Structure 1
Amino acid sequence: IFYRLNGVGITQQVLSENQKLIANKFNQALGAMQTGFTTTNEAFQKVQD
């Protein structure tokens, strides 16, 4: 993930000082989609279709 952030245009410094908060942001991003497995997820709708 860190090297990915380096590639996409985020410098080594800010990721080197903000590991945990971006980690928690990644975690809540992954968790929010869990309960969203409904009509709001268009791909879920397309699979049901």
Structure 2
Amino acid sequence: ITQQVLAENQKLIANKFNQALGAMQTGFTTSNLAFSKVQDAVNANANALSKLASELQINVTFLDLEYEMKKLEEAIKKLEESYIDLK
């Protein structure tokens, strides 16, 4: 019936949205891993530059991304909790 088409399309919407949620979780998890790597690399190279300049007035800048990565984790958790079970 047209109502059966309504039910089918509604199930399709739920299916597509849940798959898209999976994709977004992947994207944000990967962005967080990359941000961790970026923070660590910049801070290691800042420490290297500071050590070298100390050997021989140069101040190096350090990166702190903890709050941002925590926020990304919270967003991923919300995405996990936003899955849909049609009755």
What TM-score range do you get, normalising by the shorter chain?
0.3 to 0.5
Pair member with larger Rg: 2
Q: TM-score scaled by structure 1?
A: 0.45
Structure (1/2) with the larger helix percentage: 2
Q: TM-score scaled by structure 2?
A: 0.27
Higher normalized contact order (CA 8 Å, seq sep 6+, divided by chain length): 2
